[PDB]
């Protein structure tokens, strides 16, 4: 609804992943929607994040929302 954050799409390379602590670090390409340059950033897996098999070193396509100080993944998959 109205106050909820918008869904941001991006692409990048997985630098590391820890399913136990719900952490994925992604070196992503620029994101115009939030005025971010190419960056490495901490993303957060939630129980709702729609995942496929992801491993360190994979190129990925993903969507997230910014909710306070966390970047919450909505979905992630390997990409070309
Ligand atoms: Ag970022």
Does residue 1 fall inside a structural domain? Answer: no
Domain count, the chain: 1
Angle, alpha carbons 47-11-77 (nearest 5°): 45
Does residue 28 fall inside a structural domain? Answer: yes
Resolution in A: 1.0
Pairing relation of β-strands 23-28 and 70-78? unpaired
- Cα dihedral 45, 51, 53, 58, rounded to 10, equals -70
Does residue 54 fall inside a structural domain? Answer: yes
Does residue 21 fall inside a structural domain? Answer: yes
Residue 74: how many CA atoms within 13 Å on its side-chain side?
A: 13
Q: Of 44, 53, 40, whose CA–CA distance to 71 is shortest? A: 44
Strand partners, 32: none
Q: Which domain holds residue 14?
A: 6-80
Give the CATH number of the domain where residue 11 resides.
2.40.50.320
Ligand 1 centroid from CA 40, angstroms: 6
Ligand 1 centroid from CA 37, angstroms: 7
Which CA distances in Å does 46 have to 38, 39, 63, 69, 78? 24, 22, 12, 14, 18
Ligand 1 centroid from CA 2, angstroms: 24
E-strand ranges in the chain read 8-18, 23-28, 39-44, 50-51, 59-67, 70-78
Experimental determination technique: X-ray
């Amino acid at each position: 609804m109205e106050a909820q954050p918008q869904v941001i799409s991006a692409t990048g390379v997985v630098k590391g992943i820890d399913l136990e602590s719900k952490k994925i670090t992604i070196h992503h390409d620029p994101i115009a929607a939030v005025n971010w340059p190419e960056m490495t950033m901490r993303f957060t897996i939630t129980p709702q994040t729609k995942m496929s098999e992801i491993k360190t070193g994979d190129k990925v396509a993903f969507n997230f929302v910014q909710q306070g100080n966390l970047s919450l993944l909505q979905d992630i998959k390997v990409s070309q």
